[PDB]
Amino acid sequence: TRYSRLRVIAEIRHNIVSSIEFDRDDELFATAGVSRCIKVFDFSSVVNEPQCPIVEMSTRSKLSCLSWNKHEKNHIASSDYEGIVTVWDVTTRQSLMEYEEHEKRAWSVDFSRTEPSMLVSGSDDCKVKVWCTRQEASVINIDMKANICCVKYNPGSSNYIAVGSADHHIHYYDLRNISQPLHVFSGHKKAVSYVKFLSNNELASASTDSTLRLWDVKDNLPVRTFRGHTNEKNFVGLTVNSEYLACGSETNEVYVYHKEITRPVTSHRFGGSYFISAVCWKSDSPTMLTANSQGTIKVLVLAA
Amino acid sequence: RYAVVPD
């Protein structure tokens, strides 16, 4: 009842945007994708004006993912299609670290919230690599059996990561003992393209089986399956907060689910065969960033 | 191919 629609409050008309992410204060956001350019925008300027990024950093390869540092305001990590994981400073435009151990494209990077100098990546090379910004070599390496689409730190502790794998499972590791995952969550019927935490104990996933799923990582239980969107092929984006899940669709529509309800609360047609390619809630608010395969960016807000 | 999930 609370929300029935997504309102468009701003649009930046346009290349696939692989990632759209807010900085630690939800003040700036960044986009990156196939055009090899990490762009930073001021959120309030975008909402209030009738355009230009405040930072543009060119890269050697297409980007798959961005993650802002949760403590250092100005630092943002990227993963790219060459496998390189880079930490950048958006004020100086410097690449601070270039981590080059992955042998194939890296699909994701994630900075830890609670140990903010730690970041984790996953790759088509089937490795999870944990990095520290004060060290050039990886700190932890997990050799897995299938391509890795996403790795995400638990929001409450840097000891736990969720790994979304092409083997259709979520592998939940305690990095203090990587011999076996704590638990492997089965239920998806295709690759797990995203994993995102709603809270310390609640994990969501997306898959190219056209479902989202919710899981309990305290008691290692399946919770719920969400359906309505079309996602059989692409990285279409997943973002969650304390109560809501949002994802893209190959129908060029953004979908929003409340975590207790298996069918969508609402959806938005972006306005061809375009796909939504990136989504990001503004923390626990009804406001969201979205982008699609044409490079269009929209700021949306859930509304009654 | 870009933004295509591994099988």
Residue numbers in the entry:
A (entry chain A): 351 to 364, 372 to 407, 411 to 631, 643 to 675
B (entry chain B): 406 to 412
Copied sentences from the primary study:
COP1 contains an N‐terminal zinc finger, a central coiled‐coil, and a C‐terminal WD40 domain, which is essential for proper COP1 function (Deng et al, 1992; McNellis et al, 1994). COP1 regulates gene expression and plays a central role as a repressor of photomorphogenesis by directly modulating the stability of transcription factors that control the expression of light‐regulated genes.
We tested this by mutating residues Lys422, Tyr441, and Trp467 in the VP peptide binding pocket of COP1. The COP1Lys422Ala mutant binds HY539–48 as wild type, but increases the binding affinity of UVR8406–413 ~ 10‐fold. A UVR8406–413–COP1Lys422Ala complex structure reveals the UVR8 VP peptide in a different conformation, with UVR8Tyr407 binding at the surface of the VP‐binding pocket. Moreover, COP1Lys422Ala also interacts more strongly with the constitutively interacting UVR8C44 fragment (corresponding to the C‐terminal UVR8 tail containing the VP motif) when compared to wild type COP1 in yeast two‐hybrid assays. The COP1Lys422Ala mutant binds UV‐B‐activated full‐length UVR8 with wild type affinity, while COP1Trp467Ala binds ~ 5 times more weakly. The COP1Lys422Ala mutation can modulate the interaction with different VP peptide. Unexpectedly, COP1Lys422Ala rendered the UVR8 protein unstable, preventing conclusive analysis of the effect of this COP1 mutant on UV‐B signaling in vivo.
